[PDB]
């Protein structure tokens, strides 16, 4: 497909780009500290997903060159988002997200990534240095319309419930792709030291989702059929911004009055700990000629 937006960090990207909030990422969804304190560019420390490598000839000595650097996205105790200059701090959440933009604007991108059939690509790698706590729910990747809903979500960790139930939940450490109604479409163990490659095809006319998945250098394969996603709102209210990072939900604090425990934006137990996840291969393409499945192959889809 043609690339509509490329969030694969160039090898020459820097903290300074991040602290200017320039293309390709809007960095506003974070705590008060600079964007670069929460999101680190990993240079040569971490090899990104091999799917988008370039290959060398001859194939000895080095087979390939990385075309991107991985990103490490961190949350910590300062990761409280204040919406605007005047919003109530989101004290229930710990969040750091990057949002796709083009020419300085997320708004202008909405029509481009919101029409026809669009493939949202992203690959995750477990951070062994600041482990995610799977007792809590983490919303990692999603497209968020105006109303705060998610057309689809990549989630990991035990889903938030009020009241609190057995924790960890079964398969808490499985990466999960959810539809807009929070139905589990596909789930797979978040194995360590492994690039978990995803593509979610959104057909904006028919309101469908299809999940594609692989590990490491393996080409993406389809792991769901084309599935109805019919709770998405009609028209422009169904479209929204592409986020990736970590949105960590709290647990219920029974000390809180029953009338506020459901309000996860402002209430709940959040320990003051640091947690990370690494991203690579994050980009958006249409389905011209087909889906990019990795390793310089395209696959026809319909």
């Amino acid at each position: 497909g043609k690339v509509l937006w490329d969030g694969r960090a160039p090898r020459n990207y820097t903290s300074f780009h991040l602290d200017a909030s320039v293309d390709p990422y809007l960095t506003v969804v974070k705590g008060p500290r600079a964007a670069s304190i929460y999101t680190r560019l990993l240079g040569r420390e971490v090899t990104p997903t091999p799917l988008w490598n370039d290959r060398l000839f001859p194939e000895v000595p080095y087979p390939a060159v990385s075309t991107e650097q991985a990103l490490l996205v961190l949350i910590g105790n300062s990761s409280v988002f204040t919406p605007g200059s005047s919003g109530r701090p989101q004290t229930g959440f710990r969040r750091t997200e990057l949002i796709a933009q083009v020419n300085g604007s997320n708004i202008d991108l909405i029509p481009i990534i919101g029409k026809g059939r669009v493939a949202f690509h992203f690959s995750v790698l477990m951070d062994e240095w600041h482990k995610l706590d799977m007792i809590h729910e983490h919303q990692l990747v999603f497209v968020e319309p105006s109303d705060g809903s998610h057309v689809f979500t990549l989630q990991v960790g035990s889903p938030f419930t009020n009241p609190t139930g057995p924790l960890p939940a079964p398969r808490a450490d499985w990466l999960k792709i959810l539809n807009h109604n929070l139905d589990v479409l596909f789930e797979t163990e978040f194995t360590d030291e492994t690039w978990h490659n995803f593509a979610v095809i959104v057909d904006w006319e028919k309101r469908t989702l299809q999940v594609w998945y692989s590990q490491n250098e393996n080409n993406l394969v389809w792991v769901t059929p084309v599935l109805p996603n019919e709770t998405v709102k009609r028209g422009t209210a169904g479209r929204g911004d592409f986020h990736f990072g970590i949105l960590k939900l709290p647990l219920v604090n029974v000390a809180d009055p029953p009338e506020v425990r459901d309000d996860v934006v402002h209430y709940g137990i959040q320990p003051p700990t640091t947690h990370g996840i690494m991203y690579s291969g994050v980009f958006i393409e249409d389905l011209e000629d087909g889906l990019s499945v990795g390793n310089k192959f395209i696959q026809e889809v319909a």
Side-chain angles (χ1 to χ4, degrees), residues 25-293:
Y25 315 115
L26 164 64
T27 58
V28 67
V29 179
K30 53 165 183 76
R33 312 274 311 274
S36 59
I37 295 298
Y38 301 108
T39 296
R40 309 292 164 69
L41 293 159
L42 291 177
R44 275 172 257 96
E45 297 170 15
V46 181
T47 310
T49 180
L51 290 188
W52 322 113
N53 283 349
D54 286 337
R55 290 219 67 225
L56 284 160
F57 179 112
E59 295 156 46
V60 73
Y62 341 137
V65 59
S66 295
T67 58
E68 64 176 306
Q69 63 179 313
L71 298 139
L72 172 73
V73 174
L74 294 170
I75 52 162
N77 196 50
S78 73
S79 298
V80 175
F81 177 57
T82 295
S85 301
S86 304
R88 176 175 177 179
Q90 295 193 336
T91 49
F93 288 156
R94 289 302 178 276
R95 72 198 294 198
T96 295
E97 290 137 57
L98 298 171
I99 293 181
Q101 66 176 192
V102 74
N103 308 298
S105 188
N106 65 103
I107 306 301
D108 295 344
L109 184 63
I110 297 172
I112 300 168
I113 68 169
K115 283 169 190 160
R117 288 162 76 226
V118 177
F120 298 82
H121 291 262
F122 47 91
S123 300
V124 296
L125 170 73
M126 175 166 285
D127 178 15
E128 63 212 0
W129 301 98
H130 321 89
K131 295 177 206 188
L132 293 168
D133 177 18
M134 299 310 182
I135 293 294
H136 290 249
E137 170 180 348
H138 304 73
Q139 293 162 23
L140 293 183
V141 177
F142 46 85
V143 164
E144 191 180 310
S146 286
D147 63 4
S149 68
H150 297 165
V151 179
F152 69 81
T153 311
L154 176 73
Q155 182 194 70
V156 74
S158 306
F160 170 84
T161 73
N162 178 31
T164 304
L167 291 169
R171 292 182 168 192
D173 59 354
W174 288 38
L175 298 163
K176 307 192 187 55
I177 296 286
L178 312 182
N179 74 13
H180 175 281
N181 193 58
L182 302 187
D183 304 308
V184 179
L185 308 189
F186 173 67
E187 59 182 0
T188 192
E189 184 180 356
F190 200 176
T191 54
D192 76 321
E193 294 179 3
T194 301
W195 278 112
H196 297 266
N197 310 128
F198 292 81
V200 177
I201 297 176
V202 180
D203 179 341
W204 292 110
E205 292 182 301
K206 279 141 270 156
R207 305 204 305 291
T208 70
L209 294 174
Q210 195 182 20
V211 181
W212 298 65
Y213 172 71
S214 69
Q215 300 193 354
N216 299 136
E217 76 282 5
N218 296 111
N219 296 336
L220 294 174
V221 307
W222 59 280
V223 295
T224 68
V226 172
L227 291 169
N229 194 204
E230 289 275 35
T231 63
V232 169
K233 279 171 171 153
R234 305 299 215 65
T236 59
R239 282 72 167 183
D241 300 315
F242 178 69
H243 299 222
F244 68 107
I246 308 167
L247 165 54
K248 186 178 179 182
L249 265 63
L251 306 180
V252 170
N253 187 354
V254 287
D256 290 326
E259 307 97 314
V260 297
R261 291 172 184 160
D262 293 310
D263 178 23
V264 288
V265 183
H266 307 114
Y267 298 90
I269 296 160
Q270 282 293 2
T273 44
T274 298
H275 314 264
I277 201 173
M278 286 169 178
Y279 281 101
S280 64
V282 181
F283 70 104
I284 296 157
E285 61 173 349
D286 67 21
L287 286 177
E288 182 179 21
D289 303 318
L291 174 72
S292 305
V293 295

